């Protein structure tokens with residue numbers, strides 16, 4: 042019949058290849074995908090009342106915080122990624138940019154940069170997390186102020202334990218300084234802006250940069266949300282969306298679930314089995330998006346038995 046998949050924008054390229062593989066082994070199946078920012082993909086199910094067979098997110102923790110237990114009973118952590126600052130040969134100061142000086146280039150008034158909507162998209166809130174965490178790493182308590190506070194409607198407070206809390210207003214009230222910032226609904230619409238030279242820099246994932254042939258600044262492991270060992274450092278920044286939901290700096294870990302209100306749950310089991318199996322792993326390696334092999338799952342007693350063999 043019809044397989045409805047809601048997935049992250051960074052998952053577009055591997056999910057296209059996964060679709061072609063799934064339709065080759067299942068002839069009468071039409072896989073319709075809706076790519077959006079992960080929080081918005083989750084909000085399709087939990088708030089708009091839309092039904093999906095597969096939900097895959099760029100931040101696994103959106104599943105237990107927003108879906109469990111009304112819309113989901115389990116999740117499996119399947120992939121990793123890394124935040125970089127992407128650019129081309131047409132980008133200003135691209136010859137002179139590195140790990141040590143990226144934010145000073147971003148500080149310049151003739152330099153325009155891009156990130157996605159933090160209310161809707163993990164990459165959008167991660168850009169904020171990366172930028173704030175840079176303050177303690179580089180011993181410069183004005184990086185977040187110069188780049189984000191002076192140019193948007195976002196505000197910062199400090200929690201009692203020392204954690205920085207970024208407040209995101211309504212999406213229309215973010216009101217970016219057009220000279221400095223291009224904002225988009227999802228991270229994958231800004232790729233066309235970086236190609237044409239409309240922006241100079243772009244906070245996106247390493248997998249996406251490799252998918253477009255972009256040059257990238259390899260940001261430090263302490264701030265780039267890539268390494269498990271730096272999880273205690275990443276947790277010192279939180280982002281609050283307009284609806285009052287709080288996301289926490291953590292390593293970038295992708296998560297999949299089959300919702301409770303899925304129409305084709307039996308067929309959804311097979312897609313996720315393909316995803317977690319050796320075929321799915323290979324597709325993810327090829328697109329520069331490190332798979333978690335074997336996949337880490339919670340709520341295993343609620344999982345289908347076919348999928349229980351593939352998880353930890």
Ligand code: MOO
Nearest residue numbers: 049050051079164
């Ligand atoms: O969920 Mo994204 O891959 O941060 O549009």
